[model samples]
Structures are given as structure tokens and as C-alpha cells.
Target: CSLDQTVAPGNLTLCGNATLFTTFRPKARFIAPEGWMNAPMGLYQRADGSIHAGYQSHPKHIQWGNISQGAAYSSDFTSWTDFNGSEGYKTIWPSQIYDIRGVFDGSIIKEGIDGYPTILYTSTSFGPLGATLNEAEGTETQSLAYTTDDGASWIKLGYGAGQNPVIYEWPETNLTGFRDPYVFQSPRLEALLANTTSITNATGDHFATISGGVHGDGARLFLYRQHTTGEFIKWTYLGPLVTTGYKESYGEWSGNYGINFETAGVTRLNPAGAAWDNGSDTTAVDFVTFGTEQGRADHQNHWPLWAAVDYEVRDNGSIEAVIAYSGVQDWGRSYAYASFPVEGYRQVSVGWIYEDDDNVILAKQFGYQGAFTLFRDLFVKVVENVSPSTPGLFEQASWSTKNSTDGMSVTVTTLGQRVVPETLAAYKGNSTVSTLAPVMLNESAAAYTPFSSQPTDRFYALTGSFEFGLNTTAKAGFRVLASEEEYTDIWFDPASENLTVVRTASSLIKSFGNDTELAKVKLYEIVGAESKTLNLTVFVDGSVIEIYANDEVALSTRAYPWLANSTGAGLLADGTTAGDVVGVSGLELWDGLVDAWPARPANTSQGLVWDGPTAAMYGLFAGY
Candidate 1:
């Protein structure tokens, strides 16, 4: 019984397992219809302009309880709406009394209150049995959430004048963390904190940051401003804009001040390169980006860091800042990301990929898990490192002597993501493209170069530019969703300027957990015969996989393939063959994946026909 045409026919109604997980469900990343979707909070644009977002869901099962907040509007970000007929995020939940119990990660307040769109997020228990915290309206505060008709519903900020945890605690105290709340604006850093420090309540138009640490006194972010009265929901604290230690690391390619920090942000660029509204202009670079937490000890435990700060307008105005050359924006298994601020001063992001699905009883036979990590647009790039070798996180490093008198020439400064060009021209509608061809590797004995019409059943897009001839240590690239037993290796080596993806055979699902994701980038730098190039890019959605090396290393992975033909697409080249000369030029082959819930509804009641047992007998999960 193929379970009634492999499910997907109707009313699974939201979770009943979508027939063994709608075959590794992904169809263009950005999920949530069933349950558990973490991080991806606050990204705004309303007042009728449409496009909205918010996440950290847990609507009913597949585990991860209570926590709520979900919304995804669209005026074309690949047609999304997240049910308007009804359901969790049926406007907003954890129902008030101060987020009754949960509604974490916030932002989305580029000014808008009477005009609506408000949101400041993060609120914890003390309401549902909701009882848990040890005291003080029971921990983690900061509220305010609005909507007024444009989103059909949602309002919280009840009671008196300026009430509802409108930032209710932590400006100091034995803290290890408080919560994420980013609220931002920068009249170019408020005219450099009102003419470089010496404040007398200078009344900042907007600014904020929260994500903590300190009990032993280490990692921090506190800072605030904008509260010369109400409506902007009272705020005024401006302390600790940067503090360190707690796994603190700003070396080996940056990232790690772990112990506490999640969803921190502070964009304001042009430390030499800009755009994204030129960060208030006249040079600033207080870039800061976050989500550390255990940061990394290897194998991406968590990261999406970035830094290049600067500000100390002191003399008692007391604004702190200092953190240069920091990196690691996306190595793998992406997380936290949800930046806001847009309208000619640029700021936009989206991330959260969790799910090596090592078993929640196979996520209740698959109802839903997590996704969303595309929709970039954030700028600040300026590169020049002539030929592979420029890390001190760029901007003339490797002991600059003007890049050693212009030979090893350098001028780096990174962070620019771009993908949102109206979300890739509305998800490449009309999908038409198939041109790949220009492979000719000599020392290429580990070959494989198939690329026919390519559309192995759904979603596509593969780009190319390998080049490296003087053998640059072999490895070469591309192989997404390939078949003959599952292929998923997207290589590139250039003598250890690594960037790998390999997913250990991408899955026939033996618990679907395998890792080979690596990153060690330098984009390129080779002369005397001009070879070494690596510009890659790949995106195969159906169990998500987005490798984009050379846009300066990025890896994000997860593959679950249950053959109906592992959606093959190819190119690979092991170590070397005839005196090396690898060359695989610009291929460009984009295709489908619009499905951001094409009016969703199918899955007529549960899936995979399993219900329980078989995980080698021990992890027992009685599906509630």
C-alpha cells in the first residue's frame, strides 16, 4: 500500500506526520505548517508594504512546547502566507499576561506604533502553568507587539501608560543572559552618540541590543536608548556595547565570545566598503552580528558571527566598543539569524536550519522541524588580496605593509550576502535554464560530469567556475543531490584554502546524521599562469543543501534523500590526472522551488505508516 499515493492528498490538517515527512520536505526552504521551527525572528515591512516574518514556533506537536510566534506574509517573497484561514500564529500566541509563557526573539521597530507594526519580543513564563522562573515576573522580559488590521490581528502592550514588560529588567546584575531584543536605528550612530560622547540624556532616536553574560564577568551586549517618553515603549540604558571573555576568541578566523549571546545585531557599515543604505554615511563600521553560544569547538556547535566595531565616545558619555576583524558568518547548520532594518539604509537576513533529526522518534514520523535561511541583502564588501592568502579577517592583514608593497596586495573588509533581489526575482518564476558545459580537467581521475536537462524532480540552481590548474592540491567541485546511492559532495581545495560539503553520502537515512562540512577560505590568489579560481554556488531544496563557497565560504547542510531517484546533478574531480589543468567555467543553471506553501493543506492524516518502534528498539516515543 503506497499509503494512498504517498500522502499529500488532503487534511493531515497540520501534523499527523504528512506521510513520512513529505519525502524530506523542503521545496524551497522556509517552513512551518506543523511544528517546531526555531530562530528566524523579526524582519519587518508593513504599513501595507507587506513582506513580514517572525519565527520560533512550536504550534502543537513534533515536540518543543509552549514557545510561540510565527508569521510570514508576502507580497512576493516566493508567495508565502502561513495560513490566513487559521492556526497557531493565527496572529500571535502564548497569549498575553506578558507573553503568558513564551514568545521569544524580537526586533521590527524601525519606528511604527500608532501606525502599527510594533514588536520588541522575548517574554518568558509566569503565566501558563507557565509557572517556572524563580522570581521577578519570572525572568526574561521585554515585550510590546502590535499589528492593527494589517496582519488581521495581534496586540499586546495592554494595561496602563507604557506597560507589559516594555523592557522590564537586566541592565546589570549577575547575568549570564537576559534575551534577544534588537530594536535599531542610526542617524549614523546618532551623530556619533551626539558628537562623540558626553551625553546629558541626548535623546537617541533609536538603538538597542540585548544578549548577555556576566556572573563571572565575561561576554555582553546590554546597551539601549530611545525613551524620552512613551510610544517608542520606554528604553534608556546605554551600557556595555561590547565586553569580552567567555570562550572569547577573535582569532583563527573569528567567532566565539560564547557563554551568552544570541541574536545580537548592530549594523552600521562603511569601514571602507558600504551600501545597504550606506549605514548612515560618513564612515562607521560598528557592524557587529551575532548568535554564538558555545560558539564552536569545531564542527559548528553554533555561529553566525561578524564584527568590526568602533566607538568609545567616552569622557563619561560612557559608550564602549572595540572588536576588529571578526568572522564566521555561516559555516554550517546555520542558526539564529533574523536581522531587520530596511528602506535605503539596508539590513536584512534570515537563518535557522536545525535538524540533523537524530530522532525525536524520527520527529514523530516527520511532521515538521525547521528551515529558513535565504533572503540575504546586507552589504559591506571590498576585496583585493591578490592570490589566496589574506586572513586577519581582511582589510589589509597578513602583516600589511600596504600588503607588502602591493605584491601580496590586500584590501579586504567583508560581509555582504545578497540573495534578495526581490528574493531572486520572485523565486525564478517560469523556471527556464540549462546550459552547463565547459569541463576539462587533466589531472582529474576521480571524474563525474553529468549535467543533462537537470531538474531531478524539483528545485535547482548550480553555478560554477573551478579553474585551478597548477594542481593547486586537487579536489575540484559540484555534485548536488546526485544518485547511484546518494551523492552530496561539493568540493574545492586549492592547497587547503578549503571549502567542503560532503554529507557522508547524503542519506539513505540511517538516522540521517553525517558531517563533512568544512570551511577554510581565501577565495583566490594565484599568478604566473593565472589559474586558481573557485567561485561556486549550489542550492538543491528538498532536504535543504546550500553550499556557496567563494562568495567567500558558506556551507549549510542537511540531506535526507529517499530515492525516487536521488535527484542527480553533477561535476567532481578527485586528485589529479594529466599534469593538471582543471577548468570548468561559468555554468549558470537555475530552476524551480517556489512552493512556499502553495495554498497548503494535503497530508490526509498522519504519515510514514510507522507510529513507533524500529529505531533499534530503545528510543521509544509514544506520539502523544
Candidate 2:
């Protein structure tokens, strides 16, 4: 039976006590195993249809140095299982002489007749690079390795006779900051090859291998093409992809790869900005989207940001880089992520999570290497077709109520809150608005939506506007419940006129930023000494929750509840005095989104990472 092999609902352990230790870990997102740093490498979908994810790991401490490649697998992109053992649960590390000092970031792909997964990563003999300490720059080199036994292991494939490094240093250019090898097929390859006579019988997939470049020549993208004679190996240099020359304004370059759109054709998303690694403030990362244009001397680069309109490219000449629907974590801050497609549109990106890279103590205190700025779900919904900014005819929503142990009754609406049908057509020009009726509470009453029972974890998005009515003795806000005993409370105290998020309720995990200041704007507060009402837009994704109050204050924090049902959400009004009732209004909720992660499969594994029959008991996954 599948039950015999399947892990228990809350357990992340495999057969021989190899636990993923994910109970309190960030849901939906990927993190290096404990004592690791940076998610450097990208992701790959193996032949068996499982995702192969890679990251930079340190076996000892959280401080960045002595890095190695850490690999994990997942049938569904939402939940991943680390290949555990004394070998550090690592798929590939710095073993060979070429990369003995440390292994840097790169990518993986399946090529040739044997159909094995080949990995191209950066090997550094010298110490860490950048402005900080130790080694001089330019010791970085590109190397290759392929896995024969599925993705279980890898064998280093060197260049020429003695298996030396492949395309070591960019010919005569003193730029040694070269790294990040991205290999994908390109349509422009056929034309470029026909003009030059580098290798014969190059009649296969024409690939483009790009790497991020830095030095006196500013920040750039180095391009190369495939020149395979027998096995898929050799590459021919094809000049810089962007051709900006060099400058100090380009900042430190990173995130070099190719993305092909079904409708938009091929475009590259590259980020360049000041290096923010070592307590240094460079600048906010600048990202530019580039499209390919045919120039006499190669493909000319055009920026989508500066172009009057998007450049049109034919699908026939475009080489399918990674498989369609394969998502990626976009560059910039440490954990900034951007996916390939959401639904079918290629331009749609679901934003990113911001992190403070300098705060190690505060970060480690919360079990994160870096302190998170916000925790939000991919499975969220935005209330639409109405605007709360303008008072309008609103439809009263019916809500379900659950009585608290203190005899307080909680109620929530079963339907999505929106403007009434009569006003919907007229208000189409105005911002979409969704509103919920105020719930009155005498004791500590909480109202919940009996949506569906599906456990919400990583893949979901929720967007809504809320307002709290005045009651000196009442405290009102939203609560995400894991069980009756555990939850993360985001509430407003009218007495203090302050909005706070208390994450101490969960017995399993201790999170930082609790009782943190939520909102700061006076417009959302009352006139006199005490506050009257609270207006907030809340987004909850996995362990991250970001609350925006009156567009003035943004409070982002983390919360980890042990159970899968931790996704259950609703509003609460805790009245301190008898006959004291607080009113809460305009409550709207969305079920996040399922963008980068793949949809459910036919023979889905029943292992629990949230989303299952158990979730329905608390009325969690409602609507879609």
C-alpha cells in the first residue's frame, strides 16, 4: 500500500530517520539545509518528471565560506525531500581538484544519447570573491559534470585530453569575476554558425551558454554557442549578450540565464546592482528585460524597459531553453523570486520576498540565516470589482460563526465579499472593491470561513481590505489558526492605538518579530487619544505575513504553526469588558495562487505537506 511508504501527515522523515526537519521550516519556498547560505544554483526537471533543486551549503556554520552544492528532489514543486546521509545529503560537492576550495553557482540539464543530467558550475581555488577579505579576484573557472544514475550522482567531464577546465577565463580579458553558466538552445545559433567554420557536423540543437561578467568592463552577459562533434560538449564564444561595454554604474552583476515565452518569444531577465553581501549598501537592485534583435554581427540587444513596444520575434528561430512551465527564483536580494508563467501569460510575475541579509543574529534567532521582511502565500486571492476608498452600495455577506470556549460566538461569510451586483457594472471603472459586514463580539469571539478543508501551505495568495470599529475594551484583527491551541494573531488594540502581530501562540516554533509594530499612519487611526478604526491589507504566504495599513505602513513577519490546518483564517473581536462589543468590517480573503508549481498529477503521492482531507475539518480550502 502507498500508506506503508508514505510519510505521516506532520512527519518529514524518510525510512532511516532521515528527516527533512520541515515542520517549522518555511512552507512553499526552498531553503538550504541548516548551516547553509545562499540559493545560488537554479532548478532542473529530471527525465522522471521530478524537480532537481540545487543550492550553496556550508557543513559547519551560517557564515558564508567553504560552500558546496546541496540537492533536493520533489515530485511536486511545493514540497522537497533532501537526499540525506553523512555525505551531507549533497548531490554534488567540491571533491575534484578543479573545485577543491569551493563550488559556486551554476545550472543542470539533460543532454546526448545517454540522457543523463549534466551540471555546469563554477569552481574556485582561491578564497571568497567580492569586496570583503582574503583572495584576489579572477580565480573563477567554469567546469562540467554529468549524472548517469538518474540524479543520484555525478561524474566530472573535463576539457581536452587531461580533462581540464572548459573555457577558463574569457580570452585575454582580465575579468575573473566570470561565473553562472546557463546553457540553452538558441535560434540565432544556426545563422552565426553558417558564417563561421568552427566545427563540422554541428547539425543538432544549437545552444547558448551565458555567464555573468564583471571587472574593468562593468557588468555584462558573456554569450557562447555549442560546437558538438560527437557527444554534446564544446562551445564557441559568441561575444557579450548585452554589449554595454563596462562601467561602475552596472554595479555587481548576477542572474544570467535565458527564458523563452510561448507568445512573447525569447527574453532574458538580468539584474545588476551594487553588491549588498558584506554590510555594504550598494543600491536597490535594478532588473532589465532584454529581447533578441538580428544584427549583422550577431543578435543585437534591445531593452523591453526602454523600447516603445515589445520587439516581435518568430517562434521558429527560438530554441526552447528550459521546458515551458518551469519556474525560477529571480535575482536581486537573497531570496527574491520570479516564476516563468502563471496560467499561460509569460509577462505575469508574482512579485518576490524581501530579506535583510545583514541581520544574522535576529535572522538566526528566528531559524533563518537572514531575517525575512515578509511572509506571504502563493495561494492568495485579491478582492475585486469594488473600491473601499469610496463608500458605495455594498452587499451584506453571510458568515459562519464558531463559539469560543468563553461563550463568545464567531462568525464569517461563506461567499466572496464584493460590491453588490447593481453597483458592480457602474463601479467597473473604479477600483474593484469587496467588503464584508461588521461582526460584533462581546467576549473573545472569532469568526471563520468554512471554505474547504484543504490544508494551505506554500501555493496560495490572499488579498483583502479590513476595517476595525471603535470599542475601547475590544481588540480586533485576523488570526491564522493551526488548531484550537495554536495560531498567529494579527490584531489591532484600540486602547494602545497600535497594530501588532503576536506569533507566540504556536507551541512548536518560536518566531522573531512578535509583538512587532504593524502600522504607523495616523490616517488609519482615530482623532482623540484612543484609536477608532484600523484599515489593513493583509497577505499571508506560508510562514510569511505582510500587512499594509492605509498604504503607509508595511509590516512583514514570519510565523510557523506545526499543523497543516494552520491556514484556517478569520477575524476576531476580543472584548475585555462585559457589554463591550467591537465591530470589524470590509473583510475579504483570497486563496493565494498556484503559479510556478505544477498542477496536481494523476497518481499523486499522499504524503502531507498541507492540502488534504484533514484540512476540511476546519473549513480551510474554500472556493477554488
Candidate 3:
């Protein structure tokens, strides 16, 4: 695998099969030079800012079969250009006939379909036309494709008036599951029914969503409206706007809305726009976002949610929505996450790092798997009466909003993942920033922060400011990607104010997932006024890590480290008694990032391609 795809300043291109079983793949995160990607589909960005992404791949086996759609591009999550390959640029696959047999997950309407950005996917096949539903996994619909020129290729939506599974499997509520299908543009629910005069031209309508679950009655999101100025294959549903009753969850940090639903959508947040806010399209703030299926949240496997719809504007103007203040977009493993809207005012997103890797024969003996985390944005995070966020809402991001005249000026509405300023100035010309000189552990575990063999050693980045001592049971944080039998703890316990990340020694290979994920972060008091400092940043990269504590808290996980110089990094601490201490100060870090693979650039002169065959050898050569 490391047989040279070429790039210098310490060689980059890290493919699979032999870079030590592909050292858990990712070099700058965003995988696809091999197969089996997940989520992050129809990503939109081109107004020349160059984004274009798509996912739910499975190109010629490494595991999960059939599901097509792949392609990629960059502009700046550092390098990237992939667009799969085998014979050359073929883009989204699954030829006609209702997604022949796959091609799931969707989004990216960005006022597209005519000017090029379209997408709106989710297609599957079998059973004459409908119901094979969940448990069987197909027959769902809602599809389309677009990409003239600027994106270089694509154009699906096959038979008739904006066709291609356009909108089916929806009517009657007896179902038990369905598929993805996002699409945005909710200018605050069309400015709350624009003048509410019986929907007088709800100005270019574009709202849409679709995730499912029903049967014993629960898990929905349906909602629709399109058909106005930009048709978008005409929709209309607008009913299950938001339901739960399935596996539900709005308490332990909003995790389960399970029993069904998968890759749901609804964005619009804006306020100091970290995930979004490009000059206020009137400071909207909707939310909803999801990912679930038979409930899975404690050590998480697929449970990414967000809540805060709360709309209402009836009397013929009809637009209800309910379901308020929930959260939990990532507690680890990451999922779905594909919101767009960048540079136009913020609203960013990018998830699905999936894989605590339960060894599918070492994932087809390492050829490639999944990733795509940090690209976040989606704002509103004010804080005034800060202990409740320190109490429930686990790392707080919603269910607060109080502010002014009393002791509750909260304002939560979360998700603002930073890391853009043109990819942080292109990782500052192959970065290396340092700064240290503030840590102060006790039971020992610090010293051994190696990284710098290049290819961005597993891509690093830090930042600090922790503390503890006064009654400390001590545990301290940061140990990112290490060796000597592996490591991956982002510690900090201060006696149960949690904020963990452990991952059981991160892989001596007992099938990866060593479980630990925690996060009830604390350490920001006021009484003495100098204690508020639990800040952290993390970013790791080789097997995807991304912490971020004190943006109130975050925890994206995964790590494999079969030791081959596991990228060395540490700081943990320990101590259970005697003068226990634990501290860290402005200690910054940041390693070389480079090679985001589009052939590690240097103008390979329009080079890299490879996703052409395999949807079972493209229908045995005649192509699917």
C-alpha cells in the first residue's frame, strides 16, 4: 500500500494492505482511494469555492455490498480530488431502474438541478416497486443527480417529470423505515409563511427531509414542500414534521430518536456562525438533523441527532414542526452529517468517521473504509448562567436561551466546529507550531510526544489549558495517537465532571473499540474568577479523533494503532491520592497536515481517477 503514489516532505499517499495493515488509513481525513465510504453525500460548494463531495460508496468490495455513489473534490479540507476511478471520471453510479439496486444517502440542492449542483439521492431496488422496508433494507425512493461540467460529470433522474424515485414510500403511515433525502433552503420556514397570507409564494420553497419509522408508530421527520420556484422534483408531504416515540431521547444529551430514522436533515442555524452564518439570512435557527436505527447511544455506534424545530404558523398557512432543544451530534464514531451552505453565510457540516472496526477480515485486509469529520459549523452558543450546561444537556448546545434582566441569559443552539480560514491557511505551509510549557501532572504519563516522521505523522494539532489539584482525584487529558502498546485518552475527570475519551489503550488489536467516550465536562467556575480553563482542541487524524472540550465539549472517536510508531503523543497524568495535581496551560501544538490526497497535488495535471467498475463489475462489464 505504501508502494509510492508519491509526494515529498516526508512522503504522503498512504493506501492500504501494507502500510502496517494501512495504519488505520486516514492521513488528513476524508477517505476514498479505496472502497466502502459511508454518509456525507451530496455535499455542494461550487461557486468556485470548489467543494463537491458525495458518499455512501462500496465500490468493489471491502465489505458492505452494492450501495453506489462516490466522487470527491476539495478546494481546501487540505488537498483531496479523488472522484473514484477504474477507467476515469464516472461519478455517481447505479445506472437507472430506480437506483438499479443501491445508491443511497442524499442532499445538495443548493439551488441546483438546473445550474448543476442537484443530487437529492436515496434509491435502492427490488420488490416490484415498494415495501421491502427496513429489516430488508431497500425499495425506498427519492432520487436525482446533476453535475454538468463544473463538476465534470453526472446527470441521473431518469424517466419523466423530474423522476427517479422522486417521492414514494411515503403515503399512509404503516411503514417501518425508508431512506435519506435532505435538501435545505428554509429561510426560517420561508420567513414563517412569508406574510402568512395563505402561503403567498413562500418564495422559492426548498424545505425537505425524509427519514422514517412507523409501524408501532414512531420515528419520523418526513416534511416537504418544494415545487415552487425551483421545482426540485416537486414534493409535498409536510406531515410527520417531527415525531419520536420510537427509541426517543432528549435527556442524556439528545442521542436516541431510534427505532428507525437515518440521515435526516433541517438546518438554518446562524449566530456568530461557526457552523453557519454568512451574513444572516435573517438569523433563522431551525435544526433537526438525525441518524438512528434501533437505538444505539451509550458507547455509540450510530446516534447523531440535533433538535430545535419549534415552529408554528397555521390557519391555512400550515407549518407546525415541534420537537425542541435536543442535541448529541457526536459522542463518537460519528454519523451522517452532510449539511452544506458555506461562504454564503456559514452553516457547515461533515460527519461519518465510522468504524470502531470489528474486523471484517481486517476490513478486506485493509483496502480502505471510512472518515470525514471536521468541517463543522452551525451556531448560537451564548452562555451566561453556565452551570446547567454544566449540568444536563451534557456538553450543552441547546435547550437554554434565556439572557438579560436575570441569571439565565443562555442561548444554546450548537454545532460550530472550527477549522476553516482556508483550511487554517493551508495548515500554515505544512505546519509545525509548538508552544508548550505549562503542564504539571502527577502520577506520570506525560513526555513522549513524538510525531514528525512526516506524511503529517497522523496529522496533529493541540492547544491546552487544563487544571486540577484542589480536591483532585486527578486524571488530566491529551495523549493522542501514541505507541508502546497504543494510546488515545483525552482525559480529565475532576471527580466525575467526566470529559473522557479513553478507547482502551487504543488498539493492541482486540478488534479496535476499547470503549470510553464520556463527556460531562466541567471546570469553569466564577467565585475566584481564575478557574475557568478546561480548554482543549485535539485533532489527531490517522484513525480520526477530534475532541474539543470547552466549546463546551465534543468527542469524535476511533483509533487502531497496531504500533508501527503509532505516532507518539501523550500527557494523561493519573493519581488517585497524595498531593494529586494536574495542569496544562497555553501549550499549543499542531503538526504538518499536507497530503489531502488528490494525488497530493503539485499539479498531477488532472491525474487521479479509479471508481469506474464494481457495482458487481458494472453489471459484468455492460455497466449498471
Candidate 4:
């Protein structure tokens, strides 16, 4: 779920709800309020649809491990423009004051492979310090800097002594991992890393690559053979290379009892399920996690591969890779999930969760850092095959409600389960009941993904059916299974024309009586003899409605008018007996109407008026 609603590139646009906001990356600890912070990392794409994102400006008080790099910019990852990076906060540093440091969290991709566009970073001081600076020292390297201009000005190809890192010596232990140098762009052209090795702690090797042909200054790797220009002789020694597990415990955790091990940014990308083009499957298991902290040794912080950068292989053969990291610790809000190549390896993860007392501290609250809490982003997908999401009865739209202290009368049925469509335009109908309706859907599985065992819920189902009174027929319906718009499911069937009052088999929702009030409720229509209307919705807070007609299926329910004050009683009826009159054109009252019958009171008036002669006959009139 590349942020759901998917579709991105060029004309800009990628953000109908682009998320993943924060799973930790707040440096020097804490700073939020531009959608709660978290690296969007130099994503560009601004023709008009907007989306700039290139953040990571740290600095609030980083002493033992002095860091404050913090820069920010966003076009639509929901409003941001920070720009902070004065190079760690502008300091001449005679020892303190506004003091400063060098090298920001570097991430500025655009040139592909040095045709000019570059900005890779990781230039801290006090050599090899990164395990939260272990005990602090100085002289950290692993660098590269370039800005043809966009970033305004910068050029330093050799500060910590020109990248080239092939694992040197200076550590046998107690030296803690090397600084965090990140950079990527290798279809073999060269320049790739997952970096972190501190020479040796019992020699726990660390290094990953798709190639390593160019790196000098001692980090070495220029095994040359060039033909045109930049000349080279044959500097060999490819040395150190293993795709992640030579065993540093995969990258260690449990730092400071709160755990901390951050190398932060890195990328080779191309697999989070193929980003968007979709089509994945080769035994498919290219994921990566790492965010840990079950115990902690350092100070508890987690980035989990900053979010996984590259694994390689693909032109037609396929083996994409991706890993965004973070989720489950739960403090303010957290989540990260993406395994795409278009459904082959299937991993959809979505997250946000947080609600109140958010005093903060779940690693800086998913690391967005401040403001008390309210997150909730959860979308989570991994459905494959079927049978739990609501599988059976006939689910295209889906339903299976309940709520019957025995009186019985609250059902919406339809989860048929057929599943087969290479094409027939991809039929999206298997009977949860539909009658010639239209909001414009020409077909094609109405946009795929409908193989639900059920988990895309907001509640509201059974869309049409109505007759009423001496019962010409009654079989109600509603549809939405999930919504956030103005009020829904009213209790799961309460007979103001049902709305909601279910409580028997399972869609859950049922409880109405303390005087419900969508303006008092009143929906009727018998067509030939009577006609009515008055489902005036204005309730706002999870809505769902479904009444019936003729197919004779009786009543169906689901209600939650905030519980209508707690079941005092306006309508929450199940059929066969307990005051059953259910069947109407409209009637949703949480105490609305003033009564007066068809006078100036028109909004379809409290009862009977289907444009007059009951509109010639009505079965919800086959979907208006």
C-alpha cells in the first residue's frame, strides 16, 4: 500500500493520503508539528500536483553524541518547509555557545550516477562512534557531497578522506560501530552500502553491496580497467561483502535497556512490492525489520534500516526488494509496511495508532516527537485466497449482522463467494442484492481487491428495498461496511426503517432505545396505497442503514447513534413481534420531525408521497 490510493510520478500528485509519517528519526531527540515528523527523504515531484519532502534537521541538545542535523521541506506529505540544517546549528565552536558539527543526514537523489546530481552523507567526528557514540571520541568518516545547484551550494568529495571504505582497522571491540555513511545507485555502475561495521567486536562483519568498484582513501575499492578518460590501473581488493548477516546479530538491538542502534538512511529500493507497477512472485520473501527494543542497552531508538534500501535483480526476471521498518511498540503512533511488486509477495502494512494521554516517549512517539496524540493511520492488507473477512452469503458489498434477544429481526446476508475473473470485464456481482443502480461503475471488478474475508470495515450495508404497512413485502438492504461520513449503522436495525440494530450472527453493532434522534425518524412508502419520506440524516459519526421490502426478507439492523443516549427506545426492532412495522422510503429520527403531514414541511415529508402515486411501484424503485 504505497500510501494507499496509489499512483505517482511526474505531474506530481502522489498523496491522496500519503502516510508513514514517523517510525523514529527525530535526532538530538524531539521536534514535531508538521504532520508529526519522520523522514520523507528527498522525494521531489513538483510540477503542480506537489510533493517535495527532504527532511532531517536535528538539534535540541545532543551532548554525549552531539548531533542536530535537522533540515525539512515538504510539498504535500502534508505541509512542511523547515530548512533547518545550518550544518548542525551554526557554531564557530570555541567549545560551546551556538556550537556546531558537520555533515547533515544526507539524502538528495536525482542524478542517477554522477552525471552531476548527488548528495550522499555521513560525516560525523570522533571516528567510529555511532553506537550512540559509545563513550564519545572524534574523527568519523564515510562521505560524499555534491550539489550542481539545487541545494544552493556545496562540494566536498573528500572530507573524512573520500569514502572508499572496505573495512579498515582500529577496532577489536569497545570501539562501537562506524559512523552512518549512506549512499546508493548501483545497477552495477557502483556506489552502494548498508554500512555500520566498527572494524571488529569479536569481528562481527558488516557490509552489503551490489558492487564496490570505486572507493579510495583507505576504505579502498578501485579495481580499475576503465577505457575512456578518468583513467585507472588495476587497484584490486574487493574484500568485505555479505548481504546483511555475517552476524552483527543482523545489526544488534537492546541498547541502553531502551535499545538504540541507528544507522538511519540508506537505499537501493525497487521492492515494496514493485512500488506500483505490481506483479510479484518468486517464492517472494525480501523483507527487513530491525526496529527492536525489547530490552535496551543504549537509549532505545529504532529506525530499522531507515526503511530498507535495495536488494537487486529485475528487468523481467524479478526479485525486487523493500523494507520501510517500524510498528507495534505503540506509544503515540507507529507503522511501516510495504511489500509490493504488485501483489506477488503480498505485504501491505499501514499504521498510526495513538489516542490520548500521549505524554510522548515510545522512542519519541514513533519519533514524530510532540503534541499529545491522535494518530490512527492503520490500513493493513494481506488477504490472499479468502474466508474470514466475511466470506460467504455473497460478499461483493458484504454483510452478516446480528442482534436478537430471540425476537429476531436484523439480518443483511450476502457473502456468496465465487471468485474467478480473467475477464468478463470482471463481473462485480454475486448477490448481496443489487437492483439496477448506478453511480457510474462500468465494471472490471469495480477496481479489483474484492476477495474479502472481511477487514475493510466502517459499517453500513444493504442498500435498497422498501414497501411498508399491511406488508406488501419487506426486505431491507444497506451498503458501506465501512465509512466515516455523517453517522452510520444507527444501532444495527431499529425500525425507523431499520438503519441498524443487528445482534445475531456477527457484524457486531446493536444497541438503540434511549430515544434515538435523526430528527425523530419516519420513512414510509407503499407505492399503490401509501408513500412516505423523511430519512433526514445529520447525525455525523459512523452511519449505516438497511431496511427491506417485498423479497420479504423482513428487517435487518445495525445502530450506533452514539448509542442514542443508551437504549432509551425510539427503535431497535428485530421482527416477528416486539412492535414490528418496519419498511419505509425513509425515516431516520434521533428525534427530528415536528409532525404536520405534507404541508410546507417538504423534504419528502414525514410519510407517503413518492412523487405522488408512490412512483408507480417501489422496490426502493430498483435503485432510484
Model number with the top TM-score: 2
TM-score of candidate 1 relative to the true fold: 0.39
Model 4: worst 10 consecutive residues (lDDT sum) = 415-424
Worst 10 residues of 3 by lDDT: 4-13
lDDT of 2: 0.41
- After superposing candidate 4 on the true structure, give the runs of residues whose Cα lies further than 4 Å from its correct spot: 1-36, 40-55, 58-204, 208-624
Clashes of each: 15, 50, 18, 146
lDDT of 1 by residue, 1-624 (tens): 143422222222233454566767776657777656788776787766667877877654565545667777877555676735365354566775666556788887745678666778777755212112123434568887777666556677774556777787667876766778888766655765665344547475667788876655566888888755245777877688888886777665565667667788887755333333424554345677887776576544567776766676666454777875677777788878877755655666778887787455467656677788776766665555454342232443211212436455544556656566675665565466777768777754457776766775647878888887544677878887777777888777777767778788776556667778877676535334456677787878877887766554567778876666778787888865676667888886677856666777644223333334542242222223
**Arrange candidates by TM-score, highest first: which order?**
2, 1, 3, 4
Worst 10 residues of 2 by lDDT: 299-308
TM-score attained by model 3: 0.38
Q: Tens digits of per-residue lDDT for model 3 on 1-624?
A: 333212211222233332333556666766766656778787778878888777777653555545666767888766777754552433776777767677778877765777667877777766432222443433677777777765557778676555766787565456676778787776567666676534543445676778876766667777677756766676766556777886766666566677667788777565666233322554455667787766773544467777767678666564667865777766777778777777757767778777776545456445556778867666765444443333333444345444345544343444445655666567656777776677566545444433223223777777677766545666667787776667777877766777888777776657557878876554544323333457778888778887877664567888866555667675666663346665577876778665677464322222122446663454422121
TM-score of each: 0.39, 0.49, 0.38, 0.20
Cα lDDT of model 2 by residue, 331-414, tens digit: 212132221211211111212233332333223322324222221112111122222221111221111122335432222111
Cα RMSDs of all predictions?
A: 18.9, 17.6, 18.7, 26.2
